[PDB]
Design a protein around this ligand. Structure first.
Ligand SMILES: NC(=O)c1ccc[n+]([C@@H]2O[C@H](COP(=O)([O-])OP(=O)(O)OC[C@H]3O[C@@H](n4cnc5c(N)ncnc54)[C@H](OP(=O)(O)O)[C@@H]3O)[C@@H](O)[C@H]2O)c1
Ligand SMILES: NC(=O)c1ccc[n+]([C@@H]2O[C@H](COP(=O)([O-])OP(=O)(O)OC[C@H]3O[C@@H](n4cnc5c(N)ncnc54)[C@H](OP(=O)(O)O)[C@@H]3O)[C@@H](O)[C@H]2O)c1
Ligand SMILES: Nc1nc2c(ncn2[C@@H]2O[C@H](COP(=O)(O)OP(=O)(O)O)[C@@H](O)[C@H]2O)c(=O)[nH]1
Ligand SMILES: Nc1nc2c(ncn2[C@@H]2O[C@H](COP(=O)(O)OP(=O)(O)O)[C@@H](O)[C@H]2O)c(=O)[nH]1
Lengths: 319, 300
């Protein structure tokens, strides 16, 4: 008898929007034979605590790690607490990457954000420009915390030859998202706002001007890409997992898709008192398209309708 | 009639540490700690030192000088800045470096360019660890209105330096190398070509500036504590000052096999000169002679 060792994939923050997305895709036929997929949350172990993190990694001895856990929040949450967003995430990313390493994990794929890119820059922004200037002053604590993941990934590789990498998704949306009207992101935040407005018979209030351009990525698409990165992408440099620069949409265009999907025919107003954040974050998927040129993304408006459908179908259980 | 102060100096057993000790020597208690006092990488040991010595002001000089350099310094700077904050410290002045500046850049490098590109690949772990002090300083201020700042000195030299002929800097290494060469009757061997340019700052001058920053500089953005861009000296010029100070008339050779490192790090003291325009620095050659004098007077 001759027997080959199985792969143990530990997904940190597996209860989240991206976490639950990867769960669905792996079950829907992405998991290969032998592979054991372990999806954990805060209840499992508080990743800010070093002792709790080292215990989870010594118990579940992973060969592969997908680092999705983080102190996440939308523009109106992360701009209020830049010290907490910095400290907690640096603590978390340190604990996860080091515990993975000392438990002998072969690969670690962490999740970055398009807010890591510099404020004053040229467009489209590629993977080389991640450190070419400071990020936007609003959420710099969270931005620099995610930037330092790449610094760690390059540091582990130069000192130990570690295949620790990262991915840069755009604005993620989809089922099992945080639909809080204050803590959530733009798309989940509006999906709740239209739901309440359609129920109460009230008008829709979109925060900011409504002009900032954003690239949106469906959670189930990102999950498909995330699984591929873990199984084939062996570069230390991160990869931008995003839809084309030509497939960019405005906040007003996104708000219109949410109004269309939920069949809302009330008033739509823009609260210009609220911050608009960054006007453009336009990312280049040129590196992604050299690897997967025939990968087809879910159409924005169809994906929005499905996210709106899931939220109506599952509301009592939703966030 | 003067308000009480408790200035905690982390890493007071170093070159800059001992410099601040000398310059300080009204109603302000100066506490100089070492690695023996507390291990600043350990959170429990750091929180204990800050709860015992309850400081109103903190001068963060301690540091470890690629994964280890990054992790240890981030751990240290986190433990010190957080413990200071939760012990209600009014001001924290940390010590950055010129290695934080980007590799591919324009010269002179000002305080705005600290994040305008990646640092040199050689010591990036350390460079990024010191960069994130500024990120923390700005983060504590936006969330709590904390007056946590940092300073960027150039190449520091002076008494109580590390004069190791392998671990030390250019001037301490050249000071020990000339001492041994003058004693043994041997020739002097200077690493690299001898042409790389550096800005040198006397430890006692930096100490004088450090004390002023703590008492008057209330900006979150760091300040470059350096001599003028026109007062930049080459390593051959620096090696000549050491030779002239120790009265060495032997052979001086340059080991080209050894690395010359970064040719220029040219910093701009434009911000410092807007604050202290009449601050006079110790002349390089006089400061070199005094460092050489101290080393001969105190060798054991
Ligand atoms: N959503 C977007 O638009 C977007 C865009 C770009 C990048 N990202 C990246 O997406 C990742 C997070 O996924 P998400 O956006 O779907 O967020 P999410 O729904 O809020 O879920 C985040 C996950 O992190 C876990 N977590 C948070 N704090 C933790 C702690 N102290 N200890 C252990 N686990 C902890 C959560 O567990 P519990 O529920 O148990 O606390 C949860 O499973 C992050 O790496 C973020 O940078 C998101
Ligand atoms: N020297 C230069 O040319 C130069 C140039 C640019 C910037 N700087 C900056 O200046 C700062 C101070 O440098 P320096 O000249 O004073 O160097 P130094 O002589 O090597 O002093 C380092 C100090 O840090 C303390 N320390 C180190 N690790 C510690 C730990 N784990 N726990 C507690 N204390 C610890 C040491 O105490 P122990 O002795 O007890 O171990 C010592 O007092 C550094 O952060 C450096 O980046 C210096
Ligand atoms: N989070 C959130 N953003 C909104 C909302 N309404 C409009 N926006 C706009 O959406 C953007 C913030 O969304 P988010 O996913 O947090 O982030 P960004 O890409 O970091 O700006 C800003 O341009 C806001 O003006 C809302 O209800 N919630
Ligand atoms: N440390 C050290 N540097 C030397 C010596 N001789 C020449 N150098 C050169 O001095 C330059 C600056 O050295 P140093 O003070 O260590 O530091 P830097 O500013 O960190 O590069 C480099 O180009 C070295 O090659 C020596 O004996 N020790």
């Amino acid at each position: 008898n001759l027997y080959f060792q199985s792969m143990r994939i530990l997904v940190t923050g597996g209860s989240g929007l991206v976490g639950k997305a990867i769960q669905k895709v792996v079950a829907d036929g992405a998991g290969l034979p032998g592979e054991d997929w372990v999806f954990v949350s805060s209840k499992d172990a508080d990743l800010t605590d070093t002792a709790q993190t080292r215990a989870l990694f010594e118990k579940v001895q992973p060969t592969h790690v997908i680092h999705l856990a983080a102190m996440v929040g939308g523009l109106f949450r992360n701009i209020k607490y830049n010290l907490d967003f910095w400290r907690k995430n640096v603590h978390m990313n340190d604990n996860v990457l080091h515990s993975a390493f000392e438990v002998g994990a072969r690969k670690v794929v962490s999740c970055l954000s398009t807010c890591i890119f510099p404020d004053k820059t040229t467009y489209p922004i590629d993977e080389t420009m991640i450190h070419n200037g400071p990020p936007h002053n609003s959420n710099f604590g969270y931005s620099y915390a995610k930037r330092m993941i790449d610094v760690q990934n390059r540091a582990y590789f130069q000192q130990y030859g570690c295949t620790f990498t990262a991915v840069i998704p755009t604005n993620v949306f989809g089922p099992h998202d945080n639909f809080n009207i204050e803590d959530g992101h733009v798309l989940p935040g509006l999906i709740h706002k239209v739901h309440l407005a359609k129920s109460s018979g009230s008008a829709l209030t979109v925060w900011g001007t409504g002009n900032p351009r954003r690239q949106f990525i469906y959670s189930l698409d990102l999950a498909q890409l995330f699984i591929w990165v873990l199984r084939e992408y062996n570069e230390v440099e991160p990869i931008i997992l995003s839809v084309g620069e030509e497939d960019e949409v405005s906040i007003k265009e996104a708000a219109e898709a949410v109004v269309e999907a939920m069949d809302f025919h009330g008033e739509v107003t823009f609260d210009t008192t609220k911050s608009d954040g960054q006007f453009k974050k336009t990312a280049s998927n040129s590196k992604l398209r050299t690897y997967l040129p025939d990968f087809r993304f879910t159409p924005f408006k169809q994906a929005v309708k499905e996210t709106c459908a899931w939220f109506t179908d599952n509301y009592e259980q939703a966030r």
